[PDB]
Design a protein around this ligand. Structure first.
Ligand SMILES: [Ca+2]
Ligand SMILES: [Ca+2]
Length: 317
């Protein structure tokens, strides 16, 4: 047993490991490390997080030990993810500052056990650890219904021996996020033909409109499925293509559960019927689940778009 760093990563909030999001919706990952009282001796404390293709890094938030804040460019530096570094974040805690950071720990009770770290739901002076919030979104590269994991590696040098000899610490268990989709086909009442030109407002279960963002637009590039022009801040409106089909990609499901977790209901309000058909007076419910877009997301590295679409029927004038 040592006092050397144990690491863990959470998502959404401290103590949570699984969450579901709509593409473009910003949320926080939490990079977590125990801190030893002899931190002042350390010659390296560098965190590297290679974000999955399907994640877009936004920013690093307020870095905390217990109630105390660490300041950017005073206590640490950031190297942001880019195309050139393969989407990799590096956070370097300044060796010249290790004594000053160690002094901040005075009076604190430090978390020391891996399981205690994993279970931490707060970061306080009486149960303190290093907490790094990282703002992130799920992007268009996600596989719908698939767990998108994250982790990081700490390279730490605990020996004040004037020799560069770091060791790794890694989270034993990885948190994950997921997003989903749905496929549809518009038909007549007896399901004999497909119908183009039906238009639908996309709504949450509570009837509130789902709005476009730049990120959602990037995930739904097939203009055949979009009613009118899609621009950020405006309600999402979808359209059946001339083969009856349309889709929505990147809606949250299993909000507080794993990638196999509970489906979420959304609604379509039909606002335009295909030529010669009537507008219904009831909204259409559908669910987004692990398998509502891809039948086997755990097996694939790109969408297959093979789940059975929901049929939506129209009645003739
Ligand atoms: Ca965790
Ligand atoms: Ca050393």
């Amino acid at each position: 047993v040592t006092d050397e760093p144990k690491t863990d990563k959470d998502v959404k909030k401290l103590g949570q490991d699984d969450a579901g999001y709509t593409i473009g919706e910003e949320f926080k990952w939490f990079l977590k490390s125990t801190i030893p009282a002899n931190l002042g001796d350390y010659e390296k404390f560098e965190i590297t997080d290679k974000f999955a293709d399907g994640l877009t890094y936004k920013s690093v938030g307020k870095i905390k030990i217990g109630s105390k804040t660490l300041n950017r460019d005073e206590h640490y530096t950031i190297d942001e993810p880019t195309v050139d570094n393969q989407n990799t974040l590096k956070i370097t805690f300044k060796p010249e500052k290790f004594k000053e950071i160690a002094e901040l720990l005075k009076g604190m009770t430090l978390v020391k056990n891996q399981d205690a770290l994993d279970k931490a739901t707060a970061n306080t002076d009486d149960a303190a650890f290093l907490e790094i919030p990282v703002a992130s979104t799920i992007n268009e590269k996600a596989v719908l219904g698939k767990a998108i994991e994250n982790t990081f590696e700490l390279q730490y040098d605990h020996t004040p021996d004037k020799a560069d000899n770091p060791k790794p610490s890694n989270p034993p268990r990885k948190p994950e996020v997921h997003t989903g989709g749905k496929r549809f086909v518009k038909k007549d009442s007896t399901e004999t033909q497909t119908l183009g030109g039906a238009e639908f407002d996309l709504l949450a279960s509570d009837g509130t409109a789902v709005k476009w963002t730049d990120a959602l637009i990037k995930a739904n590039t097939n203009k055949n499925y979009i009613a009118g022009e899609a621009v950020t801040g405006q309600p999402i409106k979808l359209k059946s293509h001339t083969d009856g089909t349309f889709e929505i990609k990147g809606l949250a499901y299993a909000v507080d559960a794993n990638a196999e977790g509970t489906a979420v209901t959304y609604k379509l309000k039909e606002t335009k019927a295909p030529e010669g058909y009537v507008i219904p007076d009831k909204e259409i419910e559908f669910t987004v689940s692990q398998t509502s877009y891809n039948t086997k997301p755990t097996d694939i590295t790109v969408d297959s778009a093979d789940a059975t679409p929901d049929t939506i029927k129209n009645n003739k004038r």
